[PDB]
Structure 1
Amino acid sequence: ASLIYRQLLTNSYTVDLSDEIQEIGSTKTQNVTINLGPFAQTGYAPVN
């Protein structure tokens, strides 16, 4: 009855395929580059 384990590990390559299938219908959410940093403090020129 140990074969199950040996099979579970042996056939585990097919897991990849399943993931691909589960990724087929999954929605895609792609991120963009985000500015951070020393953002200089700029204001209005002397105004009267």
Structure 2
Amino acid sequence: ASLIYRQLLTNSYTVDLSDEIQEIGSTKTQNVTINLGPFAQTGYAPVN
């Protein structure tokens, strides 16, 4: 009755294509490069 453990370990490659299924089924979302960076404390010219 250890055949479950043995077959699970053996057939663990199927999880990869199961993840593939769940991925191609689920939605997608990608992000962009963002900046925190240095930002200058820039005001306006002295106007009249």
Fold conserved between structures, TM > 0.5: yes
CA RMSD of aligned residues (A): 0.7
Q: Provide TM-score, normalisation by structure 1.
A: 0.91
Q: Provide TM-score, normalisation by structure 2.
A: 0.91
Between structures 1 and 2, the one with greater helix share? 2
Q: Which runs of 5+ in 1 are unaligned?
A: none
- After superposing on structure 2, the runs of 4+ consecutive aligned residues of structure 1 that deviate more than 3 Å are none
Q: Deviations over 1:2-47 (max 9, x none)?
A: 0100001110001000000000121111000001111111111111
Rounded to whole Å, the distance in 2 between the matches of 1:46 and 1:27 is 52
The residue aligned with 1:46 is: 46
- Corresponding residue pairs, total: 48
What percent identity do the matched residue pairs reach? 100
